[PDB]
Amino acid sequence: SLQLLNPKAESLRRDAALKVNVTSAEGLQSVLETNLGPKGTLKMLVDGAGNIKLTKDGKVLLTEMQIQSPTAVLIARAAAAQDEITGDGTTTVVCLVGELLRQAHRFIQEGVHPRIITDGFEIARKESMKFLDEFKISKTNLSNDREFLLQVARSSLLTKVDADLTEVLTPIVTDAVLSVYDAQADNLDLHMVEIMQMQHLSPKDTTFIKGLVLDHGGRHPDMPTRVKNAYVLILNVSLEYEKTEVNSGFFYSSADQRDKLAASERKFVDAKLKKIIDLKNEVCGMDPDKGFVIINQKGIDPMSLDVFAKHNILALRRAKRRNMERLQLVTGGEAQNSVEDLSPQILGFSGLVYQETIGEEKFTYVTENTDPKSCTILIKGSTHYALAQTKDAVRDGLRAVANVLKDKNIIPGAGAFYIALSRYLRSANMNKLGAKGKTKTGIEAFAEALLVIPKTLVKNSGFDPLDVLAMVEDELDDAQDSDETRYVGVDLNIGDSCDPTIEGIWDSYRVLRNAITGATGIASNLLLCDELLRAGRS
Template sequence: MSAAQLLNPKAESRRRGEALKVNISAGEGLQDVLKSNLGPLGTIKMLVDGAGQIKLTKDGNVLLREMQIQNPTAVMIARAATAQDDICGDGTTSVVMLVGELLKQADRYISEGLHPRIITDGFELAKIEALKFLDTFKLEKEVDRELLLNVARTSLATKLNATLAAKLTPAIVDAVLAIYQAPAKPDLHMVEIMKMQHRSAADTALIRGLALDHGARHPDMPKRLENCYILTLNVSLEYEKSEVNSSFFYSSAEQRDKLVESERRFVDAKLKKIVELKQELCGNDGKKNFVIINQKGIDPLSLDVLAKNGILALRRAKRRNMERLQLICGGTAQNSVDDLSEEVLGWAGLVYEQTLGEEKFTFIEEVKEPKSVTLMIKGPNQHTIAQVTDAVRDGLRSVYNMIVDKSVVPGAGAFQVACAAHLKSDAFSKSVKGKAKWGVEAFADALLIIPKTLAANAGLDIQDALAALQDEYAEGNVVGLNLETGEPMDPELEGIFDSFRVLRNCVASSASIASNLLLCDELLKARQMGRAGGPGPGMDGPNDHISNMASYDSDSSDGEFEETNVLLGYASKDADDDTISRLGGTPDWLDPENAPSAAYARCKVCKDLMVLLLQVNGELPERFPEHDRRLYVFACRRETCRRREGSIRALRGLFEQLQQPV
């Protein structure tokens, strides 16, 4: 009997060899799902949610975040891989592939009697040496547009088809270069990604300015203006009610007109100052124009006044766009109209509005300094736009990584082949003593999963392609795999580069995850993570046990649930059949004909409704204290919610305690 079962006979656990098999099979299973996505010739997966929404993607990050993964080991690997994307912007599929292959290679040696600790020691030595080798293998380069084009194209080609990747690459590189001001790092938040369901994905374009997802709210306002002064405001240009709740009464039409006039007096005074500034700067010749972008509201009467004076006004602009406007157009956002002058205004060469169906877009271009730009992503449908958006984000991060690291790594599997050969070379293998050398060899073999999978996804013979790469590298050439011919090629000449940062994190995180999983010798089914568990059955008196469960699953527990205080009659007997059968039958004291009232509340974990499984008012046996005689037990109705199982276990324990003889 294990220690966990000694403490709690009902504990669910998996020990030693069985736990190791569970972890290894989970890693291999997740690897099998994602390996067909790797590389430019990888396949596409279709994700369909419960509402029937479709998403087509080959991005490992999207797949791991949105797939329903139930195996706990696979969930752990998926979280680590998505963390790789958060840090580096790419490499999620590679992490999953490498973790799965490390576990597979380790299983080969474990089945021959080698202890997992020895293998993990070898993994650690191999990881340290691989990172040292990566530092010598990388190519240090200065920031150059042609190099950035190759880096972005390599990243995009793994997410999109080659033709579309080639068309999007210049837009992505130019977007980053526009906001890049050496020696500071580029701020990718200054690249706005706007989506427009229109035409095809190949029409995605870079706008060296700002695109707003709304237009003017008055039909008579101009749709296209050149040589524009830009006034950014955070001023309300609409009638606002007073903070004091008051009423006014009038007895004649004249008094009503005076009341309306007094209400408009403050807004009209603001409008007058704006119109006077426009007349002073622009005149009436039409060579210069005036645009207002306001973060607050503009009422219809104010819009009418501005339209009559030829002013284009946009209201309720987003705050982040207000900040970008000041960066690209100049000027200063104003919280008042009292001190308006030419110095506080920005400038744009062209402002125009485009209507697409029922949506309006306003474009501000030909600005002074495009320190912020917009990538307008187009596509015929939503899932195409989503696919392109994910690829563009990865492309932006790849360019960012190259600018920050000022180095790249030859791609197409070149690093993996070279590193595997280095780990198996006499120069390094002689420095590894003892059985740990088998862990190093397993690590070296696992690295080759990347070129093997690239060859398999291209329809090539895996062994022939790998042998050709290894033979060529043995002659002193750095080579990658040409996926069209299956022959070795020079990645640097072909312009195929991997990100140094992505590879470094991929090697380090994969080795750490695989080592932790190999050293896991027992799986235990735990209580809720982050919540202190109450004592198990038999460890305290029955009164303490019931009190703990009441505080754990009652409607007053730590604000875990929002009680709606809505009582919906009696719970039907059929609604509770599943729960009662899982509890081992109906207890004597629970009368099915007089089922407890069914209250509903909202589960904060999954936002679904949960049902009151049990409501006891004064029906508990006399041996329980008075404060325990009023008890509620809730359970979430969603089967995958972690609150459901906890509630069932607590209710089962309560039933057992109640059925004990006095």
């Protein structure tokens, strides 16, 4: 039908479209199968430029390696979109769609329709949402348990990096997250927590700074390096020259009038500097002990830097949009734009301001605040890929622990959620459900597909995956009759079951919810498609 219409085209239908979606799914699954879990293998990505970037995140692997298949680009958007808002569960979405297609394809070969199979996944998904309410556990945030946040931070950090980096980088996240909770209980991740690159001694020397760190310092030598008590000032006004909207020549007639008009360039700048001097006169007391610093969002003229250097005022220019939205949280002051209306109330407070330089670059450190509402995480590293590995680790770790404070619940992991849904879907009475007909295998297909995830953790350790679930099955058979509510786990060190409640392995709530919802939608849409084709003008 397509060859007589289009003189050139490609068409697959009714057996190859199903084999393509399953073969491409099994192919992409094998790539990210080994990365899943704590003992998984690392993966570097080097392009033709020659740069190196190292991480285990499936999003970085998918959004850097170009892919030609039409199925995998939907898995790429699904794995990326789930991680872009949640920050965790990337490879879990690929494994579910990677496993649910092959687990249903065996029954498509038997002759079951794709429509009624996907109808079983949807009604089975509603059972999992009802199971999340009973499976989760309530946790009160008023206790302010720091040990509970430490265990959540080690869940994601142990997966990416080893124990040496996890132990030193875990309390860096906990100290940053401990300040997030407040009376308003409004979560703020992007403005409050930041990441900055700095090539320094080693990755292990990452330290926590309570104040806002800046990537610039004092240009002039005579300007002060260290300041004990520095009251900041925010000004978004540009203090260099301005070209003035079509204004043209300073038509000068005589030679004396030439430089007389050139001196007017300083008058516009000096009109704004005098307001700073008038502000300094109000806070002139204890001038050797105290200090003053000005932070500008736009550039400052080098002619005006000597004015600040004479009065021992520290100058910082060309700040980011985000840093201006963070000085009020750290120093406690208020922002200002125009130099007309000033007051001492808007000035912040800082207990220690010092600068340290390496090579050509220079960094400014601010800390020792009275009541800092925000902070930073200055990560140290050796190579560029070391920063990229710490970028993805801190980016995925902050989002995972931040979601625990959003809600009042937390899901235990280590296969407890998948193993619990297996017994629930395989033992629940079907008469309570509304599905009938050939929906018998759809419940078994999706229930059995969840088992492949916790044994993929075992496949990286090298043990037999089927044998380490024998005692797990025998434990739950007696746990229901023993009248003791416990949740089992999968410990890869010894190859035996464990309890995530005491070991500290946990997982966020919206990760597993959005993962199955996004995976079931993608896997269902790929099953119903029975024809592939390419056509268009080019």
